[PDB]
Structure 1
Amino acid sequence: ARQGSFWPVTFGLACCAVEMMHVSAPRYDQDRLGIIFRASPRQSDIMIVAGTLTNKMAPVLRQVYDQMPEPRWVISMGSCANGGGYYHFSYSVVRGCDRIVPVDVYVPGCPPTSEALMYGVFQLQRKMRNTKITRMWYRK
C-alpha cells in the first residue's frame, strides 16, 4: 500500500524540475505508477529535492522537511542536489543536501533522464519492499 500510491511534494528548484515535470509528461508518465503529487508538505510522502540548492533556500527546505509525516524519504534528484554538483564552489550554494536533509535514494547527473528519475523511484520502491517494519516490531 505504501509502495503503490507514493506521492511526493514538488520542491522543484531548477532544470531538474523541468525533467520532473517531464515525468508528468505523457511519454514516461507518473500516473502509470501512481505518482500524483500534491503541493503540500503534510499530504506528502517523499520529498524530491531537484535543482541546485542555494545557501538561502536551505532553512526553508528543512522547515518543509520537518512538517512532513514520519514515514518520510528524500530523493536527491540531480547532481547539484547531492554533493553540490556543478556549482559546489559558490559562496551561495549548499554543498549537497546531505548537509541538510537525510537522503535515501540519490539520482545522479545534470538533468538526469526521466528514465533516470523513474529508475530511482523504482529503486526506492525496491528499498520499500525491504522495510520489514512489522517483523521489526517482532524484533528480528
Structure 2
Amino acid sequence: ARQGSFWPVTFGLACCAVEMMHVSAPRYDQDRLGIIFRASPRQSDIMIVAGTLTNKMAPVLRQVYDQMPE
C-alpha cells in the first residue's frame, strides 16, 4: 500500500521541478504507479527536494517536513 500509493508534497524550488513535471507528463506517467502530488504536507508521505535550498528557504522546508505525518 505504501508503494502503490506514493504521494509526494509539491516542493519544487528550481529547474528540477521541470523534470518532476515531465514525470507527470504522457511519456512517463507517474499516475500509472500510483503517484499523486499533493499540495498540503498533511496529506503527503514523501518530500522530493527538487531545487537549490537557500538559507532564506530552509526554515520553510523544515516546517513542511515536520508537518508531514509519519
> Same fold by TM (over 0.5)?
yes
Higher relative contact order by CA 8 Å / sep ≥ 6: 1 or 2? 2
Stretches of structure 2 lacking an aligned partner (at least 5 in a row): none
For the aligned residue pairs, the C-alpha RMSD in angstroms reads 0.6
Moved over 2 A (4+): none
How far has the Cα of 1:10 moved from its partner? 1.2
Percent identity of equivalent pairs: 100
The structural deviation recorded for 1:37 is 1.1
Residues 60-96 of structure 1 show CA distances to partners (whole Å, capped at 9, x for unaligned) of 00001101101xxxxxxxxxxxxxxxxxxxxxxxxxx
Highest Rg: 1 or 2? 1
* CA-CA distance at 1:53 after TM superposition: 0.7
Residues 27-60 of structure 1: CA deviation (Å, up to 9, x unaligned): 0110111111110110000000001111110000
TM-score by length of 1: 0.49
With structure 2 as the length reference, what TM-score do the two structures score? 0.96
Q: Which sections of structure 1, spanning at least 5 residues, go unmatched?
A: 71-140
> How many residues are treated as equivalent by the alignment?
70
Distance 1:27 1:3 in 2: 21
2:37 is matched with which residue? 37
- Structure 1: distance between partners of 2:27 and 2:37: 17
